[PDB]
Design a protein around this ligand. Sequence first.
Ligand SMILES: *CC(=O)N(c1ccccc1)[C@@H]1CCCN(C(=O)c2ccc(N3CCOCC3)cc2)C1
Lengths: 209, 207
Amino acid sequence: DKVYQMKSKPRGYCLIINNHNFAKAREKVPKLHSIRDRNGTHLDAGALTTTFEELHFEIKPHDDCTVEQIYEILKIYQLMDHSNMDCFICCILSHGDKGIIYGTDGQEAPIYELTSQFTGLKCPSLAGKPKVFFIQACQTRYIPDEADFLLGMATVNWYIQSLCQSLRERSPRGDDILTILTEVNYEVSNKQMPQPTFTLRKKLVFPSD
Amino acid sequence: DKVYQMKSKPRGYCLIINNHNFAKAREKVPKLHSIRDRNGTHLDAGALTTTFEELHFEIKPHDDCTVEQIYEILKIYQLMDHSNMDCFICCILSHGDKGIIYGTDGQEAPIYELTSQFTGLKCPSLAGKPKVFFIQACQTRYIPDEADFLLGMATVWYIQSLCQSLRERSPRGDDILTILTEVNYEVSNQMPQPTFTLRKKLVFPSD
Ligand SMILES: *CC(=O)N(c1ccccc1)[C@@H]1CCCN(C(=O)c2ccc(N3CCOCC3)cc2)C1
């Protein structure tokens, strides 16, 4: 029973990346000649703003991002001085694939190339602090070989909905994020299942009290 | 707040593949010309048996297994009728590339191709009940999209702290993730990566 240093104001930045218009994708990329536009994402996005502002993160959201657009966004936060922070969360809501994420231009960012941005050897002020990634797909490893990491990855063809509901619910009760994820795993299987993989050293909780 | 039904005598099978004599690997596979014999792996193995025999698991140890020996041992328990069991554990001590494992003949086996044997479809006798995998290989997907899996794997200590923190805590009723998060700090100061798709909590009562 060790718990991460959740308590601060604010606790961290909650990156929300929220791609929707894959128009240039439908144009510039052949194999994605007919890729639907991920409308309805705002319900996921709005909930992600809702739950995580309540848990004392300052949401910094971006909509419709290229891979280049996605990539430069994270350097802003890799190079940022996180010393005053306690945690770091990044949500990505886009079309998915096996181990990669699609930008609105139809190009690809591997899940390992995004997570690996925030190491200790790359983001030192955010060392020993938990670094969380929630991703929801649609239709090598995924994490640096380092501690203090969580990847809530899923693949659609509602995950973010139930994840929010269990966060709003369980967090003021003092349940940890792993407890929440098992509850989220059950809350969808009745099987495009999410596979949480992590390297976190200690318990991670988002206290509302 | 659910917990996997673990009350069962025996709780389940607990495979312990234990590769040590990689002579045949050196003997035939040239890039594994000087692949070291895994000396000391006979210390992890005993800890695992001791840990899980206390946890009411019928240990099934297997030493120095090649690739088809492995594909055939999993084949047995894949076709088995675990209807009176409440859990399935498979330990693998060996070494390989980032995604494969090396049999004692240097032949490969993707870890997915192992965890993928105990599906619901491929092992209906094991539906809705935890299929746990521990892997310690010294230096794509890893588990199928079905529920009730755990993959405590370490690219490479891990198994000795996994055991010590398992006999120490499983009596107290703590969840597996609580345990796995603890062995992370012990290993922290290379890193294991537990991917898991479990629906309820998971404890091993000690009675
Ligand atoms: C890959 C491997 O074989 N490891 C390992 C290395 C790094 C991290 C985790 C695991 C082995 C696993 C077993 C123990 N070990 C040793 O180096 C070792 C070997 C022999 C001993 N002796 C000899 C007889 O038994 C008692 C003491 C001690 C340690 C790491």
